[PDB]
Amino acid sequence: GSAPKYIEHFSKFSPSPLSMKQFLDFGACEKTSFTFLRQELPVRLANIMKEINLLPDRVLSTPSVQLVQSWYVQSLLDIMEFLDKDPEDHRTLSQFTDALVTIRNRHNDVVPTMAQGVLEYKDTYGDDPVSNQNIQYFLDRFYLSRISIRMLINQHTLIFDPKHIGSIDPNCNVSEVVKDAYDMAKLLCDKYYMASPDLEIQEINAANSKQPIHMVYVPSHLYHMLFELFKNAMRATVESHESSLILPPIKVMVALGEEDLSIKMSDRGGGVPLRKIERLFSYMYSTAPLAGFGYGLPISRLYAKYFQGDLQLFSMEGFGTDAVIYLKALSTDSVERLPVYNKSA
Ligand SMILES: COc1cc2c(cc1OC)[C@H](c1cccnc1)N(C(=O)c1ccc(O)cc1O)CC2
Ligand SMILES: CC(C)c1ccc(COc2ccc(CC(=O)NCCN)cc2Cl)cc1
Ligand SMILES: [Mg+2]
Structure with a gap:
């Protein structure tokens, strides 16, 4: 051969x-x-x-x-x-x-x-x-x-x-996909925990504060990412509050700027000390329920990177965690990021 x-x-x-x-x-x-x-x-x-x-x-x-x-x-x-x-x-x-x-x-x-x-x-x-x-x-x-x-x-x-053009929706409603991912995470959350936090979505269309926020994207990819983030944020909110009575909502902000479309998911689950954040993105250190252990975060981060996006966690230990999906907003800036074989071996 x-x-x-x-x-x-x-x-x-x-x-x-x-x-x-x-x-x-x-x-x-x-x-x-x-x-x-x-x-x-x-x-x-x-x-x-x-x-x-x-x-x-x-x-x-x-x-x-x-x-x-x-x-x-x-x-x-x-x-x-x-x-x-x-x-x-x-x-x-x-x-x-x-x-x-x-x-x-x-x-x-x-x-x-x-x-x-x-x-x-x-x-x-x-x-x-x-x-x-x-x-x-x-x-x-x-x-x-x-x-x-x-x-x-x-x-x-x-x-x-x-x-739709195969996996691409040229008129992707971001809030629609957020709710879809929420509704599905809620289903599993209610199953395993018999309680779920509620959702609040706020949108900020900087340039057009009326118009609902649409983009050219691959919705399954966005779903994948929001699903994983919801699961984490639900697990964290619920477990940090099993003594307590209230379950704080999960709040999603969708901001459209000149070049960034940013989606922040804010939970009130007691957060993560800075020290332990990087480990959450580590294939090795996340290898062994809803959320708790799997490749969700690192792989969700790749789906983000794939079209020149990113996905970042910032927590405040004792308060909660912000997960942000950054996407491009303009189809012109939305280009495949590929690992290429070369010198750097
Ligand atoms: C490896 O050690 C820890 C992992 C994680 C947390 C804390 C950890 O030690 C202290 C933290 C959490 C877990 C349970 C209850 N409340 C918050 N998380 C978050 O704050 C969190 C993480 C990611 C995410 O997308 C959303 C979150 O709320 C979960 C992970
Ligand atoms: C199965 C997959 C996930 C997998 C599992 C395990 C690994 C780990 O690969 C290692 C581990 C240590 C070193 C340092 C070193 O000594 N370098 C010289 C060694 N030639 C280099 C590499 Cl490429 C990669 C991918
Ligand atoms: Mg980060």
Whole structure:
């Protein structure tokens, strides 16, 4: 077999970041998506596969890594089939879509699979800060790459099976998605705890204080992030108050500025000492109910970063925690953030 040759070839190429605009202007032909993706997925697969291969043998040799390395290989080979093939042939196109869906399914379990390798490494080699930064360095890049690939595939499979453009809503109502995520977190919270804090949403449209706040975004991504933040904020409010009688609401502010769309989630759950914040974003130190232990925070932070956003926690121990999602607001500033293989190895 030739996998290491292909990995070599395509890891010479750079992933090509797309903007929201570019993603909408595919709402262009299917032939164009096909010829784009049969180049670009190999480039993006190979770039990460190359980085996996740089991991020390004691990590690389583990079953978890070998297993997802084997998925990445099959998936690269699956797309090779189509490199010679003819876009004009409508059956090349429908077989390609078959092929992407198969690939997407194959990769569904990477997160907990890679999680299992983190746990194995913790017990096998220990949990020193240097182990921590390396796992954090590696997985932020790996998971961000994974997000970027799922985005491409979904965009194709959802368009080439009109208002939403695949996973993108050009008129995304932010408050609508906040409530959706709230309602769902409340459901689970009431289940496990038989009480839930209430929601208050305030909006601030600086430039247009009347108009409700719409953006171009990928709502599932925003949902993912708000869901995780609600779960945390509900767990924290409820547990800090099981003696007490009142449950303070969770307050969400949605601010639209010239360049930032900011979503703050303010809970009154007794907060986190500054010392313990960074650990909350750590894959290693969050590996072992509603919320309490999982990869929600770090991965929610990646979804934010993916379109040049961010996601920050600021607490006040004894008072509560502010979680802020920062997004771009303008589709022009909303460009893929990709980890690229190069010098910095
Ligand atoms: C690892 O140690 C701790 C973790 C977390 C907290 C405190 C920790 O030690 C003191 C804190 C919390 C937990 C329970 C009740 N009230 C607040 N949290 C938060 O304030 C919080 C964190 C994230 C978030 O999105 C929302 C929050 O309210 C939970 C984590
Ligand atoms: C399974 C996944 C999540 C995983 C698990 C564990 C790791 C940890 O990888 C480490 C740990 C320590 C060092 C320092 C060092 O001594 N460097 C030289 C070693 N070549 C480097 C790396 Cl790449 C990464 C990814
Ligand atoms: Mg932070």
